[PDB]
């Protein structure tokens, strides 16, 4: 039975908190059998001394399980949120956009799923390709019955990973929900703190697992 392993309460920094959450998620082979990504929205000074809103998002330099602060690449939120105006973007264009939005271009490339994170207005966001979520969403169960099984969630149909997915995620987000379920892809959870996003992730996946058990 999936367990909830969140033990800490005090962290020195936002990055320490997101690293902690990432490690817990990457430690469960039923949550991360190489993919998944996390993020924290944070305040930083940029090179020009401006205090700015930064999305620190998982990068290509490590898996979630053994991640450290180096594994979080800083993306300007002003830049990322301005992308919401854009209609379509190819994967390639998306990568270029993100590169031009990096607070420090010498950091490792940010997750190709960065826009899932930027476009959800919670401080912490967690994304997995949880096996039990893939199973339940790969059945013929209607989405509404999937939602009744999993809890206070919104369920989205299959959409290929990329910019359109992020736009749909953005638009289906509603105040008060615990998660967004992406059929044939995975799960998004979020919250004001790392624990909130994490607890929501476990509760939903474990409900999925319970149901297919």
Alpha helices in 85-190 (DSSP H): 91-100, 114-118, 131-137, 143-150, 163-172
Rounded distance, CA 108 to CA 70, Å? 8
State the binding site. 113, 127, 129, 185
Rounded distance, CA 135 to CA 209, Å? 9
With vertex at residue 128, the alpha carbon angle to CA 61 and CA 178, rounded to the nearest 5 degrees, is 130
Rounded distance, CA 149 to CA 213, Å? 13
State the binding site for Zn(2+). 113, 127, 129, 185
């Amino acid at each position: 039975a999936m367990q909830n392993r969140w033990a800490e309460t005090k962290f020195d920094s936002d990055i320490d908190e997101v690293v902690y959450g990432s490690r817990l998620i990457g430690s469960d082979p039923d949550l991360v059998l190489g993919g998944g990504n996390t993020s924290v929205k944070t305040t930083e000074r940029d090179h020009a001394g401006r205090i700015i809103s930064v999305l620190r998002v998982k990068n290509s330099g490590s898996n979630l399980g053994t991640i450290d602060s180096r594994g979080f690449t800083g993306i300007r939120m002003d830049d990322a949120l301005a992308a919401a105006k854009i209609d379509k973007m190819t994967d390639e264009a998306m990568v270029d956009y993100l590169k031009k939005s990096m607070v420090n271009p010498s950091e490792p490339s940010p997750s190709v799923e960065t826009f899932l994170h930027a476009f959800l207005p919670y401080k912490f966001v967690m994304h997995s390709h949880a096996d039990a979520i893939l199973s339940i969403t790969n059945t013929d169960l209607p989405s509404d019955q999937i939602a009744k099984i999993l809890g206070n969630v919104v369920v989205l149909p299959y959409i290929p990973p990329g910019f359109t997915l992020a736009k749909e995620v953005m638009n289906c987000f509603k105040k008060g929900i615990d998660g967004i379920v992406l059929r044939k892809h995975g799960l998004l959870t979020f919250g004001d703190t790392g624990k909130e996003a994490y607890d929501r992730h476990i509760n939903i996946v474990s409900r999925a697992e319970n149901f297919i058990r």
